[model samples]
Target: RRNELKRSFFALRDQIPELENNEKAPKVVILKKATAYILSVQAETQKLISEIDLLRKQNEQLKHKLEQLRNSCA
Candidate 1:
């Protein structure tokens, strides 16, 4: 009953990965982990977007090449 504030602390800290196993951590550590995880995911998002762009351009070239090869064969 005396640990009322600690309950809220657990609620907030539980969102972080390292604390997901019911492992306790300082609130400051939770903020640090959350920021790093968020930034890393955003960086991954950018990489995926660029890769998608590259694959689309590659497919367009292959389709264009196929037409030339077909026309020459005809």
Candidate 2:
């Protein structure tokens, strides 16, 4: 593994996916694009998590109501 670090750049090139389509990608540009991708994904995932939490809260309330109505049916 003498060229391990050099191989790492190749690994990075494959992993980014965006760079996979483009032909003229530089190593330093990989660092910038990878980081930008990470941050964008992080923020988007954070938003999705919060929205799911809100929907979960709504489901909990609906479940409680359904249980109460079932008790009345019994």
Candidate 3:
């Protein structure tokens, strides 16, 4: 697995095109825009995951208390 990762890293690195100063490359611009969008979505997804986890925890507590109340009145 480690060797595969090393190979993948080198292969990815090899794909990077050499850019000159004052160059306006569409590929570079598109890559930059896509990377920024991906990062923003990733951050947003992380926040939502944290919120869902909190809600799940609260739900568990509510379920437990409801069960206790039902048992006491039986």
Candidate 4:
């Protein structure tokens, strides 16, 4: 698996299709726009994931505490 990953990484590195060629080099602008949009979405996803993980942890803690309180009262 590690060897496969190394080969894949090298293959990907060598296959960068830059928009520097072709008569319609102007269309390469779309690639730049898409890359920026993807990065923005990724950042938003990371933030939401962090918040969700935190909320889940807090919820679990509260549940455990509540269970302990109920047992003590009973």
**Against the hidden reference, what TM-scores do the models get?**
0.73, 0.76, 0.57, 0.57
List candidate 2 stretches off by more than 4 Å.
Answer: 21-24
Give the winner by lDDT.
2
**Following a full C-alpha superposition, what root-mean-square deviation does model 2 have from the true structure?**
2.4
> Which pairs of residues clash in candidate 2, taking residues 3 or more apart in a chain or in different chains?
none
Native-referenced Cα lDDT, model 4: 0.66
How far is 21's C-alpha from truth in model 4 (Å)?
25
lDDT of 3 by residue, 1-74 (tens): 99996565444434444433244445455466556666878999999999999999999999999999999986
So what's the TM-score on candidate 1? 0.73
List residue ranges in candidate 1 displaced over 4 A. 1-15, 18-20
Which residue window of length 10 is worst by lDDT in model 3? 13-22
**Quality of model 2 by C-alpha lDDT:** 0.85
Q: lDDT of model 3 at residue 49?
A: 100
Q: Any residue pairs clashing in model 4, and if so which?
A: none
Model 3 / residue 44 / CA error / Å = 1.3
For model 1, what is the C-alpha lDDT against the true structure?
0.82
lDDT of 1 by residue, 11-69 (tens): 76766665674687877887788788789889999999999999999999999999899
lDDT tens digits by residue: candidate 2, 17-38: 6787456578898888889888
Quantify all predictions' global Cα lDDT against the true fold: 0.82, 0.85, 0.68, 0.66
